[PDB]
Design a protein around this ligand. Sequence first.
Ligand code: HVH
Ligand code: MG
Ligand code: MG
Length: 269
Amino acid sequence: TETVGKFEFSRKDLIGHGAFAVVFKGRHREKHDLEVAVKCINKKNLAKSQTLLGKEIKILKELKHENIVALYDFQEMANSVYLVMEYCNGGDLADYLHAMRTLSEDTIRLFLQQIAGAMRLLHSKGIIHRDLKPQNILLSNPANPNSIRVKIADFGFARYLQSNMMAATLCGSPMYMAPEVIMSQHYDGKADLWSIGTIVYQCLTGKAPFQASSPQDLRLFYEKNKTLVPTIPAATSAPLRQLLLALLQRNHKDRMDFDEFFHHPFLDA
Ligand SMILES: CN1CCc2cc(Nc3ncc(C4CC4)c(NCCCNC(=O)C4CCC4)n3)ccc2C1
Ligand SMILES: [Mg+2]
Ligand SMILES: [Mg+2]
């Protein structure tokens, strides 16, 4: 049992892992019923891990929203870093999709209204996420899809981007990366909107809109196809079809912008 400020966890309660972090379930030391997720260094990549966790602290401490996983505390030292975060008792969207296979438009709408709420704050703060994918959308059950709360997690690749500048760091997960990102071009806040479009498509159909055998194949696919249109099922409602076609535009200049996304008719209650 390791401790971190007012919190503790055991390395036996692994709930998540990637190349640059490991996450354990834990609790408050006084209030045993307050569950937390404690994110730690992955020693296999010590230096990069330490750098990313440090950056994630800087971003997350500026974001307080019901649809963004909360940072309760953290601890940074020369040779160790910990983030103490909100525990999401529903697991991730990837697992939920594995079980449901596909989601109804009504569930998709509920989830996307919430994601949109978070992105509104990110966009207003000038922050881009750069690793949106089902594994980083988490579910919280306070029961049915109407009560599920969705929270964006994992801000380790996130950055401030000034509104007149472009980013160029190659990061994220290729299946969710905007074309401009995977083709090593400059990109902006609209790269996340492509990722969101891909997540929505995957919820609807159970697959990626543009599949390939490898990252390189996917890249070459995007390179060769200047006109690119996703296959949308015939049964899809008209507003959902419109939203997907507008998000999954290859060329970022043409792609739906934030204001269009936030006010899109598919999101109306
Ligand atoms: C099998 N399933 C695995 C995933 C999972 C996660 C949770 N609850 C959870 N709540 C919050 C968090 C976030 C704030 C730190 C969390 N994190 C792991 C899942 C999301 N991925 C990551 O954070 C990256 C993995 C390297 C960082 N996981 C509960 C059950 C399950 C069960
Ligand atoms: Mg990130
Ligand atoms: Mg862009």
